[PDB]
Symmetry: D2
Subunit: 499 residues, 4 copies
């Protein structure tokens, strides 16, 4: 019900969400169950499109969508987005309810995500800061005399937005927003794990006036989405997911523009002059938020000798005093993980750390097929690098703690992981901070705060295995737009008199 | 001899060019013959590196090269490039001689390329126009209050520069220049068809002081270079080549930053109010320069009814009055094509056009295993789209001529090819010009001039199958650099008093 | 009444508008009559502040205003402006009614101005496009090695906004908007000729939440405002007025930042290939809008031989078929001029043109102390330069028409006036257009349209006697902000290792 | 002699330097003596131009100069500057010798200035970073639909460069460089106190090929230069001088573009966590360099309680151990002040500080009509604000030392002076540093280093009485260039289909 009135089919017993085929909601492919991590129960089904429908949708997006999106002036695109924001905002509780149930996200976090989606849509005007073009005069080279250049951006056409499970609502809205604001049509492919919030977002956009043939929502499972990525009518792919799937995406897509936010964890470094209360507080939150299911979840804590004790102590106190349970109790801090499978990996990873000399300082206990206590494992620097928790990203609420002699060792250990998304540094000395900033191989460094992307007010993205390019208000334009250069020739035409 | 004194080995009978392994010239892999299109004779050999040497080179570039390049301040990097420019300039005739012989490039064109390489090195200071960073204040959102961002660029590390056969000298110098100026180390992989100019360029850079462990030159043939592209220590790949190899490159490399200049041809449009003398002159040159072996060679001419006759007439007069022969005679305009194989394709492509209703207006005659007359084939709009010359890029001096009723038909036919590098439009009416600019799906549009990239004073690159991203003074920084965001948190620290 | 409920004093017989003294509405200086050009009748009075009140107001703005404005975060400043927009929009008819009566502006134009003010306030987010700062790395010079710079903008403090009579509402709103958005406090000094719309605007801003001690509205007459300009607490002066008063303003103010939009007229050039219907239509409107009382009113028409006849004919037909009368009749096109004095000058200027060989092609007849027919005077190029209509700006609906042989003569005659605000060029040939663009000495050139500033979507401002600097969304920041450079020194501190 | 071979007239007994009148060296006005502060002896004479010659020069610069400068392509302007750099560099000792003798500058400092001039000329390519223009699409507002804007910069025409006595060489070269690089003609008016270095610079530029009618050098004394400033052919004035003369300059010039670097002193703040050795060293140098005759000379030292003792102690030790004498001895650190008059003021200012409770910690002794020991006066915060050394800028090597309780008091005392050029802050805590950066009302803040403008690698300029606008590589373009906006109208012309 709600804004999905005539869309959802109460076929049989559970609500059946159809795909949006660039013009009409529908689909005639396999139906698929959508379960909740809260009780492993089926809360709905989605109709995936048949091959012919994928083909027809791409064809519409390309032959008509590109033009409907592009030929709608920017001032109107903004109105559409602002209206969509209004719709989502008045249906807030419902968007939040679905996030909590479908994603297992605590209530406060679920409401935060909806408010992020709304703000993002409402602030699309800020993305215009990187809208101008360039005028290049040609008299700075004899070869270009009496010549002139104009460099401006142009939408690419059809952008494929592939979305992960941890921000089913925000990610779809964000990617649709920055792709559409510049004149592109968009194909959204949400995680089949929790595709419902995307369906709600798309409908809200359509109600707001989004060109009906300029957007599609295909509930394709995993490798079925490869048909979209590899298609030549898809000029760009905005992907947020795991390193491994990202690799597969580029290998299937070949030459195209890409933005790959591949996550991995984030290390946090605490210097001897850091505000330890702030640090402990921020680091604990970074470790457990949404049960560590955040691309930028803190996975490693490095603190200099003289504060390692206090710091680790506080973070552990904070972590163990956390109420775990059903996401609905505004009291609960940590809800469930997306699947029993994820919890298995977390547990196997903790034993590994212990087997290699690691000691659990907090948590450690599993609580159910999809429930676990946020864990903090102490580890000696001379053995941490071979531990799974270090070498890999265990998508769960678990982090390593490691005492270090100085900044160089912290930086070294921090750079030792295969990832490079963000890093956090707590301290006050400008020199040490500047050195850390220069040497940490990451897309972003958070000084005296936990890494938090929010609506992308500041650009962020990966280095190393964390991906390529950036998302963010303004910067995202680089991934879904292409330059168009115009060279004017006035050689010998009397505009300039030798200059 | 020359600057390659102690490098080249006059082993046996022909000069043997070794690879540069990031520290020492050498190699212990298969030797390979380098023939000249001028007489299909072997003019030298190159020593390809063994697998272990490729491995060791990448290891040096990554563990040491990145730091030697990066830790050399920009002011010094510029001195290195300026010195290298001086060396190449004093050895001009020799660089030119080798281009003429190894690439089959006419003398004037060969000298032009050397002068381009020199200018590019000497003008590296202009690439600094896109060097600054961004300061983002945080008070424009409640969520970011008392926060602040700094966005700056950083070198990626090791850049793989894969080079084509048509600009063996300039392309290596260009790619090395923009990669090195920002602090990256570089692995150059020239076309095994004519790798000698690259060898000469690298040596000149080394003599100039280029960090010896920050550059490598591997004479690997085709698929052997895949080891480099697929390696995780290679953070970026700057490729100029064919659409098909480019696709393979991304599929092997996976997630990384890329700049793919994939060529394809360029269409030129002539409006009824164009200066026909200028148009005919510029279009003819665009059709035959370097025997059409230019990513931006004109391959299709579209002219409105009232001028189609004169225009086509003039271009044909100009084309047929062209002296073909040995590149050395400053008299010769068109030298040979890179291989008998290329000429075969051109011929088979001309018959195809004729078989489908096409009529040769100039040229058509083959002159030897690697020699041909630049050809101009007339064709009816209602049949051109199925001709090979239209559907594909025949890398040779051949173009189609097609009469059209108006601009919309010109634009339509122009956009009908699978490529989108540049396009040229001759005319004077601002409205018609503006419409053409908006609707031509290409990286660049040249108004009243033939498409010419030169040293990249203006950015250029492809749309559609012509590739992704741009090269050019300043813009190239986007392909070999990554953003680094720094977020400062002063929440509640008294810097701001609620703002 | 209305939003001025408890503000306006119905003292005696006419409404008495007090000044806003940065905290409280009031004033104890001479009261001054505000008459309407429609019937020379007194429609209200304004209370000018006493010297002590001017002094106290400046003191409040400086000691408190700067901080209230600055310490209110930008996100909130935007909310204030958006709210103010809403208030003005719902009180539209009333704002329009007051413009029509107080300024003598036709109804449609009056409504257009109110809608401009509203849009300007509502679009303050676009001014953020020029908000970022610059990060300057220091390794491009040996002298700056291991050094770094950050360049950001800062509000200046107290900005004096001096407003003209022709856009009593919009100009106050525009200047307040761009000054306040960056954190400055503002002192508005409207034309004592029609200060009422400003009073209404300020009240709306205050109702919206504008920091009460960060704004002032002083109804000071002419030279009384010099006390404000010359005061050291006023860091900038944004002035739109006549060349002569502007000169006096700088001479009194001394060293400070300035934006001087000094008007003067605009010449329009018509080439032989122009769309004459469009040209005649646009030029006629440029000549008469608001009875030529626009900084950018067309005052000179130059058309090439082959179209001069038709062009001049059409513009004259259009001008003479204009209904002149009371601004209220949505039928009336031209209302009255601001004062009998202005009409006198227009008449004396027309005789002068006739005496020097000029011939009236339309209008010429005076209709009352403040009413006149829009006039079009033909003139020979060899005598126009000595005519008052050419040498000076006659603020009224009157323009000269001059036949010319070619573009160079048009450009020459156009540049012959002492002003340089905008110019218009109608034609289609890119070369001729480009030449005109390069050689016209003006702040802006309108191709195929009459000069129209609108809300400043495009920056505009003068050259020559038309003033200095620009207004416009984004660009205005340069006049009310100052750079702040921060240089960090890490020499020998181990951040960089020689680079 | 030297490059001034046929220029200087050995008339009578001393060399007679004529003015350069935009075409020919000469002049027929009063001759004026140029004395040296080293021995108050006359070392040369300059011929000031007659009124008719000033008039003729301005006329040439305006009617021809603007075009010679502008019509010389930028690539050539750069060659001219690079050649001029070469000439000055080979004549280094001579340029230095003249600075030492004419300005009284120590040898090392004199050589530093010449090397600055050379680097500035040679690095003019960096000024191109702020050369591009802007392309503004019009579909973000209904009012601008099917419209488009291009914003580019244009030279203003004739720039008046008025130079101070403390950098007779560099300032002339800097101002000429940034004015000329963008296409302006320039009128240099050096301090009549030491105009010789400017004469040498101009000649070098002319020898290098600088358009002979695009530059002038008028040896006009003080108020005689007002004729230039007030002239309408002078579109901009770049002034570096005292606050009082700057004020007079704007009041005479009226509306025009200005860059006023008005100096005043700089305060330096030392926090409890500063490297005191670095601080003492840098602050001492800031206090005495060139005998404090630097716009950015440190005039006030504020140090927090816990380090005030050590800090003040060290700076005093360093100051008193300074060798004062003839600028030639590479041993001498401090040469003479520009005039006996300046030393008088310094002495009267020191007594004033003592009379108001101040205590001399170093220096204090006068050594001759133009010689003095660099002085450091201790003072209680509760009495410093009324001391001349605080309230005014005593152009000499003298600074106040004041102990303070915390940062807020330092900032408060620092902001208490009427000037706002730069400030220095030594410390390591990021929060305290950030607060100081936000609250210091100055054009620039130097963290952990003395304020030093160098060649302007980082922009710098004043706030408060220190002036308006900035100089610096790139930024200077704002003072000698104007925007030119071009608005294209395609309404209803079929370029866009409603967008
Ligand atoms: C363009 O822009 C012009 C603006 O219209 P306008 O006729 O009203 O021109 P204007 O008289 O030059 O407008 C001047 C503005 O400046 C104020 N002003 C006058 N003398 C001043 C002084 N000595 N010091 C400080 N401020 C002073 C005026 O107030 P009052 O209205 O009280 O004189 C008015 O608000 C047009 O004439 C056209 O040339
Ligand atoms: Na592909
Ligand atoms: Na890979
Ligand atoms: Na003043
Ligand atoms: Na003046």
């Amino acid at each position: 019900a709600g804004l999905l009135e005539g869309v959802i089919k109460e076929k049989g017993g559970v609500p059946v969400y159809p795909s949006y085929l660039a013009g009409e909601w529908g689909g005639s492919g396999q139906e698929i169950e959508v379960k909740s991590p809260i009780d492993l129960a089926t809360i709905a089904k989605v109709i995936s499109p048949s091959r012919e429908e994928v083909e027809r949708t791409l064809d519409v997006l390309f032959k008509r969508g590109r033009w409907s999106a592009r030929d709608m002036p920017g001032t109107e695109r903004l109105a559409v987005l602002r209206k969509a924001a209004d719709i989502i905002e008045r249906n807030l509780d419902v968007f939040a309810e679905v996030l909590v149930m479908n994603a297992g996200k605590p209530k406060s976090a679920a409401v935060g995500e909806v408010k992020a989606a709304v703000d993002r849509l409402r602030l699309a005007e800020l993305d215009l800061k990187k809208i101008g073009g360039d005028y290049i005069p040609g008299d700075w080279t004899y070869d270009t005399l009496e010549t002139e250049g104009l460099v401006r951006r142009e939408p690419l056409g059809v952008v494929a937005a592939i979305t992960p499970f941890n921000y089913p609502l925000f990610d779809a809205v964000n990617k649709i927003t920055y792709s559409f604001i510049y004149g592109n049509a968009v194909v959204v492919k949400p995680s089949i794990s929790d595709p419902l919030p995307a369906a709600m977002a798309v409908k809200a956009l359509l109600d707001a006036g989004f060109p009906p043939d300029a957007i599609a929502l295909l509930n394709l499972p995993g490798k079925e989405a490869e048909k979209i990525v590899a298609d030549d009518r898809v000029a760009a792919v905005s992907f947020t997911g795991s390193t491994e799937v990202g690799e597969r995406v580029v290998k299937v897509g070949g030459v195209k523009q890409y933005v790959m936010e591949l996550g991995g964890g984030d290390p946090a470094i605490v210097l001897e002059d850091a505000d330890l209360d702030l640090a402990a507080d921020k680091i604990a939150r970074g470790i457990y938020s949404y049960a560590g299911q955040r691309c930028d979840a803190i996975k490693l804590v490095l603190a200099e000798r003289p504060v390692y004790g206090k710091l680790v102590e506080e973070v552990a106190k904070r972590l163990s005093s956390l109420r775990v349970g059903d996401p609905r109790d505004p009291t609960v801090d940590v809800g469930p993980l997306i699947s029993p499978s994820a919890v298995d990996e977390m547990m196997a990873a903790i034993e590994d750390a212990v087997e290699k000399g690691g000691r659990v300082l907090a948590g450690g206990r599993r609580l159910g097929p999809t429930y676990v206590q946020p864990t903090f494992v102490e580890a000696p620097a001379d053995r941490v690098k071979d531990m799974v928790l270090y070498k890999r990203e265990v998508f769960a609420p678990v982090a390593l703690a490691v005492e270090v002699k100085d900044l160089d060792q912290a930086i070294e250990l921090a750079n030792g992981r295969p990832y490079g998304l963000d890093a956090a540094v707590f301290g006050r000395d400008v020199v040490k901070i500047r050195r850390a900033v220069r040497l940490l191989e990451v897309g972003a460094i958070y000084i005296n705060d936990m890494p938090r992307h929010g609506i992308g007010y500041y650009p962020f993205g990966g280095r190393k295995k964390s991906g390529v390019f950036r998302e963010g208000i303004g910067y995202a334009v680089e991934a879904v737009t292409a330059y168009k250069t115009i060279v004017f020739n006035y050689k010998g035409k009397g505009v300039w008199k030798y200059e």
